[PDB]
Write a protein that binds this ligand. Structure first.
Ligand code: HEM
Ligand code: HEM
Ligand SMILES: CC(C)(C)OC(=O)N[C@H](CSC[C@H](Nc1ccccc1)C(=O)NCc1cccnc1)Cc1cccc2ccccc12
Ligand SMILES: CC(C)(C)OC(=O)N[C@H](CSC[C@H](Nc1ccccc1)C(=O)NCc1cccnc1)Cc1cccc2ccccc12
Lengths: 453, 453
């Protein structure tokens, strides 16, 4: 069918198999496949997710044209994702004018002004974090980060989005925590999708959701109770906004679901990659406790302004995100016949930017596998192309939650490094192995020793 | 396609719509549709679940030929059910020689000899039931039966099948309880099945299970730990039996899953229908406490022999099961061109016995909507056709768990009625309304007052 498209256009790439395309090559994971394609083929190449053509690009100008210059015109949507059900209306999933509308209604939620109002609340849970860490540091029993971080990141969402305040590590079975804890793009299911994308319309008419039909109905009503218990946070910022069109009720639920997830799994996963790097680089960790103590003496509480003051803290976070950009790739569907930077791109091709591989290219990064926060010092931070280093994307469809994510993680680190130091255990996987699957997550979970200062 | 089959054969029935068949008629539920078809059409009739022909029969001789005489030859399997995944091997689902084999390997599990050994264990949880009922009887706050009964019935399964001992009402969040608590044949999904049965093979290759891919994998390993923590109950009776073919590992998991469910949802639901009837018939309830006190004076513990001694207890249970046969219908797929009792039945037709309607036919039951346990007294119990009253089916494929179910429920009742009496509350739905959906369960859950004797 559409297997001859790259041979024709003169773009190189691995030869596709009938039906499967190049997907057997995902057996080492997206990231390794991207690195190898990049090395073997240069600046542009092509491959087929089943029948779907995918054009990878690594030129910073071309990348900017896709993500910024020609976003509204050509490269507006992400790869069709399904089956979604009513989550078709979630901002990260929606398309064209429905997205533009949702991006407009939801943008003022993420300003610096509202972000500054959420700091005192994310603080109270920064303490709750300490108390549950102290119990396991005074009990010299190794600690699993995703649990305690996830409990924290869960605590921050529920509060920043609905007010619900829970000790999710100590109230792990409170129902509002159950639902909310519940996508491996290389598991039995989504591989079957790529080989049978004609099956998505089938699953839709069958009221099948990759977002289980149960969790969603919990929040559809949890919201429409809160909706009627508030006028009788994120949700509030959304109800107040339905006062360019009417932000409906079920749409409001779908945004909540996307925010809940992002602020939980992404935030907690990144915070775990950081503490790993800090533990396997003891000096970096010490240097940061020194900076935190210098800006916040006597273990003083971090404020909004003192967080943006801490520069090595910023350097550490950016560097972790270099080595582990949790999105792995950025993507846009080409909606017209177009030509950008001298190259013809036909309609329907997915254009892909392989962030993970670019973050680790030796043609922009010296010793790229090494954790070296100094790359981001205000001296060298100018020698870093913002279209090579893109942990939050770029352009009108970049990560809306970027400012909040950064602030959330950094307040976690500050209140935690004030009180504790983190040391590799015996059971600590060194060096960390990335999941061979479809997620930027560790092969084995991260386990470390903790000591009260 | 196959819509002309009953018009041809000369069998009456509602005219089918293209594609849908007669399924819009399920809008009052299977049970009402069966009663009306029975009244309007007589002893035999036909309808179409989509394209699938279904022949309903109500003649006791014909019924016995299907369920008993010609079971191995013609009417061996139940209606194909999907998508099932590895649960294809569960006994209630399997077919032909794979079923015969599993029915043979699993039958000795349910003898009177093993049943008598399980009594002391189902007893210890009969007490655990009392303590959690007393807390809500000394707190004059109405009680919801499915919860406390389900917690009990859950406690009996886990123990009778794997030894795991849990206070599931007080340990409601113990993980082994979580999984195990997790089919509406008229919900968005299964209606779509009947209209697109060609979609089941699609869902199978897509590793889609109506038994969620997660709960199953919990027990697949929970078993293969117990498998290796036992030689280093039901499960034991099965591992000991793999010592006519080798009972494999994944097959063992699939039987456990079917047993866990049946012993939980069926048992707890029936026990809730009984206490409703007892509360809305105060004399019946009193009479049974008198019989229990007479056989077990001083609130003496029930034994295996004293349970089979109690006859009004038997009368009460049978009568409840008359009014609420939780299976609603029995079914067999006709696998050959055949003729039974003067009627030609072609290959592939589902033959259906509408138990609910027959249990409520005024042509065998006087005042059938009334709860009258005397119908089952040893005087009148002979005027009751065992192919009209069939709460557990009949023949080689009848309910394997019948003896155990009866024993389990009755030990619950005895230890509970010894200590408490049950009274209708204000919020008590009288008369009980049956679910308009695809389950023999109450519209509103059953809530009753409880008083310590
Ligand atoms: C460390 C945490 C996070 C990282 C590294 C991250 C990264 C990203 C990336 C790479 C994208 C795609 C951008 C593009 O295609 O140009 C994205 C999109 C998005 N992110 Fe995040 N993200 C994070 C956390 C969050 C959080 C906490 C939220 C909370 C609201 C959030 C909400 C979104 C949304 C809604 C989108 C889609 C935006 C749109 O399509 O208009 N993200 N993120
Ligand atoms: C009050 C409780 C129960 C009732 C009213 C009930 C009723 C039934 C009915 C009507 C059938 C279909 C019989 C037929 O088609 O002839 C059946 C099948 C079955 N029941 Fe039960 N049942 C109950 C509890 C249980 C329990 C506790 C178990 C535990 C193992 C169990 C295991 C099975 C199995 C395995 C089958 C399928 C048998 C086969 O296909 O070989 N049932 N039950
Ligand atoms: C767990 C991890 C980090 C290894 O993998 C993913 O997170 N799995 C995404 C799944 S599908 C769209 C997704 N909803 C969703 C998913 C699960 C539960 C509820 C809702 C979503 O947008 N979450 C917000 C988010 C996630 C990450 C960074 N910032 C924001 C992959 C994905 C798919 C499509 C577009 C994306 C755009 C940006 C980022 C990820 C995208
Ligand atoms: C909840 C209720 C009582 C209103 O409705 C059903 O229980 N939903 C059955 C579903 S599918 C086969 C089923 N597995 C299964 C189901 C759920 C979770 C795990 C396994 C099964 O066999 N459970 C054993 C059982 C159930 C009832 C009485 N005794 C034994 C309907 C069903 C389907 C096919 C054959 C059946 C044969 C006998 C009885 C029911 C059958």
């Amino acid at each position: 069918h559409s297997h001859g498209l790259f041979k024709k256009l003169g773009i190189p790439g691995p030869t596709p198999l009938p039906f499967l395309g190049n997907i057997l090559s995902y057996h080492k994971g997206f990231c390794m496949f991207d690195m190898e394609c990049h090395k073997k083929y240069g600046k542009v190449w092509g491959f087929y997710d089943g029948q779907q053509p995918v054009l990878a690009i690594t030129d910073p100008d071309m990348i900017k044209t896709v993500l910024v210059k020609e976003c509204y015109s050509v490269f507006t949507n992400r790869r069709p994702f399904g089956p979604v059900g009513f989550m078709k209306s979630a901002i990260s999933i929606a398309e064209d004018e429905e997205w533009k509308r949702l991006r407009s209604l939801l943008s003022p939620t993420f300003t610096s002004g509202k972000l500054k109002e959420m700091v005192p609340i994310i603080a109270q849970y920064g303490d709750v974090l300490v108390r549950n860490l102290r119990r396991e540091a005074e009990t010299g029993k190794p600690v699993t980060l995703k649990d305690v971080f996830g409990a924290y990141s869960m605590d921050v969402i529920t509060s920043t989005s609905f007010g619900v305040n829970i000790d999710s590590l100590n109230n792990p079975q409170d129902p509002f925590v159950e639902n909310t804890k519940k996508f491996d793009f290389l598991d039995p299911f989504f591989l079957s999708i790529t080989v049978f994308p004609f099956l998505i319309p089938i699953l839709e008419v069958l009221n099948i959701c990759v977002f289980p039909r149960e969790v969603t109905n919990f929040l559809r009503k949890s919201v429409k109770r809160m909706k009627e218990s508030r006028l009788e946070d994120f949700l509030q910022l959304m109800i107040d906004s339905q006062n360019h069109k009417a932000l409906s009720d079920l749409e409001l639920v779908a945004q909540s679901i996307i925010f809940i997830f992002a602020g939980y799994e992404t935030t907690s996963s990144v915070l775990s990659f950081i503490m790993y790097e800090l533990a396997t680089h003891p000096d970096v960790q010490q240097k940061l406790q020194e900076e935190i103590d210098a800006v916040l003496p006597n273990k003083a509480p971090p404020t909004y302004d003192t967080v943006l003051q801490m520069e090595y803290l910023d350097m550490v976070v950016n560097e972790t995100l270099r080595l582990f950009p949790i999105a792995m790739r950025l993507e846009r569907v080409c909606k017209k016949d177009v030509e950008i930077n001298g190259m013809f791109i036909p309609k329907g091709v997915v254009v892909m930017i392989p962030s993970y591989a670019l973050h680790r290219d030796p043609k922009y990064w010296t010793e790229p596998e090494k954790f070296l926060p100094e790359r981001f010092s205000k001296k060298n931070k100018d020698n870093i192309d913002p279209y090579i280093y893109t942990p939050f994307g770029s352009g009108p469809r970049n990560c809306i939650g970027m400012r909040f994510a950064l602030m959330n993680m950094k307040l976690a680190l500050i209140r935690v490094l004030q009180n504790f130091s983190f040391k590799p255990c015996k059971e600590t996987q060194i060096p960390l192995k990335l999941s061979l699957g479809g997620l930027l997550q560790p092969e084995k979970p991260v386990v470390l020793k903790v000591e009260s200062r």
